[PDB]
């Protein structure tokens, strides 16, 4: 039922779409691999960030300074993952058009 | 752990195969990512187990989200090996 | 849907900021990454090498951030020591080191083949 939340669907379908698009693109193996891997990683990192968010909320509702930092650090990881994804697709698909 | 031998075996084959530098890096990197995600998933589990042995909807949710990450990483590894080996023997 | 990006983006900055400000080891790691990203960008290589150079050091930062979050969770739960507390950080620290060794090896292989 974690899969059914209206956020993962949006994240997932975005990642899933790119994998499909990369699967159809006329690129060589190394490019196709890198295209898929970057989007997959984002999904991987987000899943890990959500898992951390679960552990924090598991402890309780009472806000602690460290509780917020873990979430921010986890969000930062996703941000970096998404940037790496955009840079990857840019560098590889640039001048491909 | 079994994975260390498994990772080695993956590295053995990667070095065994006659592939260029870029392809050889991609193969081993994909395998290493699985270890990293598994290690990170294992870390998350260790935390959850410590807080309480008792069941909580949030405790099981983290473990599920963590195991899915491992799955996706493994899927990514298979796709990588499939694609590159297909191209290599193409 | 548009707002979900903004909220998420704001957290990420707090994460990078807190990580930066609190540790010298992080800032120096951050600098090492940024220099690596820069060097790869101007380097005369093909796109696949450039991406591999960038991706690998990015991954170091990703795992570093993720492990840092796990550490924050452990420290949150209590001052108290624990075998499962040490285990969590031990596992998370291993992941960080693997990502770096890969990064070092990958960066070493690519510059070998390019300059040798
Ligand atoms: C449980 C088994 C799942 C993994 C093996 C079977 C399905 C995946 C096959 C390889 C990945 C498919 C995506 C790559 C693709 O579509 O382009 C094919 C092309 O790159 C071959 O050179
Ligand atoms: C010309 C270059 C094209 C660049 C393509 C950009 C998209 C490629 C990879 C990024 C995948 C992002 C999917 C994950 C995602 O954004 O969802 C998480 C986010 O909504 C959290 O707020
Ligand atoms: C508003 C809809 C947006 C859709 C997402 C963006 C679409 C991205 C690419 C569309 C073209 C697909 C690639 C087709 C192609 O390159 O052909 C591959 C080659 O095998 C042809 O022989
Ligand atoms: C994907 C859209 C998000 C915003 C776009 C901004 C992208 C930022 C950096 C991506 C670098 C793009 C240039 C890559 C490139 O191929 O350099 C040109 C070179 O190949 C000329 O042969
Ligand atoms: C041609 C033969 C080489 C094939 C290499 C394919 C690489 C696929 C996965 C790499 C990850 C290795 C670790 C596997 C693992 O952790 O599973 C262990 C667990 O499922 C046992 O219950
Ligand atoms: C030259 C500038 C860098 C080139 C790539 C630019 C990156 C483009 C878009 C990335 C920002 C998307 C924001 C998504 C986000 O907030 O991350 C979600 C995370 O923090 C929590 O899940
Ligand atoms: C393509 C993007 C490169 C990302 C590589 C990893 C970045 C790691 C650290 C950079 C985070 C920037 C935050 C800087 C910061 O917090 O300074 C604010 C504070 O010091 C004001 O005194
Ligand atoms: C303070 C944080 C700064 C973050 C900046 C984000 C980095 C954006 C793009 C990284 C550089 C990649 C572009 C490399 C490129 O296009 O050159 C390739 C070209 O020389 C091939 O002929």
Numbering used by the authors:
A (entry chain B): 24 to 120
B (entry chain C): 32 to 121
C (entry chain A): 6 to 121
Q: What's the paper's own text on this?
A:
Here, a method for presenting crystals of soluble and membrane proteins growing in the lipid cubic or sponge phase for in situ diffraction data collection at cryogenic temperatures is introduced. The method is a variant on the recently introduced in meso in situ serial crystallography (IMISX) method that enables crystallo­graphic measurements at cryogenic temperatures where crystal lifetimes are enormously enhanced whilst reducing protein consumption dramatically.
DgkA is a kinase that resides in the inner membrane of E. coli. It is responsible for the ATP-dependent synthesis of phosphatidic acid from diacylglycerol. Crystals of this protein grow optimally in 7.8 MAG at 277 K. DgkA is therefore an example of a protein that produces crystals at a temperature other than ambient, where in situ data collection, as implemented in the IMISX method, cannot be performed conveniently at most synchrotron MX beamlines. Increasingly, we find that membrane-protein targets crystallize optimally by the in meso method at 277 K. The IMISXcryo method is ideal for such targets because the crystals can be grown at 277 K and then snap-cooled and stored in liquid nitrogen for shipping in Dewars to a synchrotron for data collection at 100 K. Complete data from the 12 crystals came from a total of 280° of data gathered at 20–40° per crystal. The data-quality and refinement statistics are similar, as are the two structures, which have an r.m.s.d. value of 0.238 Å over 585 residues. These results show that the IMISXcryo method works with crystals that grow at temperatures other than ambient.
